[PDB]
Amino acid sequence: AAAAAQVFDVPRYTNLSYIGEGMVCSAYDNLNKVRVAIKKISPFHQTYCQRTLREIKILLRFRHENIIGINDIIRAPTIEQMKDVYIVQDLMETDLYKLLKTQHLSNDHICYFLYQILRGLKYIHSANVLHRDLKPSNLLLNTTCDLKICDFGLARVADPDHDHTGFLTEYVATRWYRAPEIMLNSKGYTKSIDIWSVGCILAEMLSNRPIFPGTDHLDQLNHILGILGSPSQEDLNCIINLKARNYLLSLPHKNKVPWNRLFPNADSKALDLLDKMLTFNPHKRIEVEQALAHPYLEQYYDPSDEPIAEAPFKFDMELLPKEKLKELIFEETARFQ
């Protein structure tokens, strides 16, 4: 086996450079005569197996310019010999997290990046899937500013009928990008959770800093309400959950901070769209198609060039012992043999 730095056993993928977290390496593709990214996955806890299968099932079903594809999957010919799985993807120079650490974005780059995020999200949502962890780290970029959404480990089939839960239920997705209803009464099974996260990304593109950098579960909601202000009577009436409603009523009144005061340089159309993505009430929050159609994106908007999914996930993929998930992972990866 080739050792990277330990076993990283991948025929047609010759040259090799390490790059972060199993482990990830750049390599050269001898069929396609391009460098590629290869993720070594060794998942066979139950947690890692459910995540792995879900991500493979989703990525293999999706085909879209603004969603990372799976080029290849390397594994053993038998379940017995299958210990690791290698996932081959397009090599992308950077991500939006790394870009925003060092580079101011022009309004034209902001607009183009936001257009590609929403065009990929339109496809995702059309497949009845929620990403549930959209953040700068999960938006890959190449040297010509093509953007691809990655990391479907926390994705779920949408289920708005079963989205209700108790106050401060545990949640896994990244704190700073979590919609306020996650902290109040939501399992994150509605499409409006992804639109909130895109709004947070747009704000981050405008200022090179997270707009809601909460230190904890409730601090995150306080950061949100410090900008949005206290929710209206009507938005609180939508919260039936008593502990969540009473929590909101316990908070000091806060006035809205206008977007143009936070972002005095920003295009006013960008701020009008930001406002509509970062709406407290998920029912009033803009839908992905409405965001695409917003005036800020008018230079790009083309519904005939914004495809929807051929094969949406009609039903939940249910939780299964490891042995079954390993077997599922084996079957799902069979086409690359």
Curated annotation (Swiss-Prot):
Outcome after substituting residue 103 to A: Reduced affinity for DCC. Strongly reduced affinity for DCC
One GO biological process term: myelination
Positions of modified residues (Phosphotyrosine): 171
Cellular compartment(s): Cytoplasm, Cytoskeleton, Spindle; Nucleus; Cytoplasm, Cytoskeleton, Microtubule organizing center, Centrosome; Cytoplasm
Names of the cofactor(s): Mg(2+)
Entry GO CC: axon; caveola; centrosome; cytoplasm; cytoskeleton; cytosol; dendrite cytoplasm; early endosome
Subunit structure, interactors included: Binds both upstream activators and downstream substrates in multimolecular complexes. Interacts with ADAM15, ARHGEF2, DAPK1 (via death domain), HSF4, IER3, IPO7, MKNK2, MORG1, NISCH, PEA15, SGK1, and isoform 1 of NEK2. Interacts (via phosphorylated form) with TPR (via C-terminal region and phosphorylated form); the interaction requires dimerization of MAPK1/ERK2 and increases following EGF stimulation. Interacts with MAP2K1. Interacts with DUSP6. Interacts with ARRB2.
Protein name: Mitogen-activated protein kinase 1
Organism: Rattus norvegicus
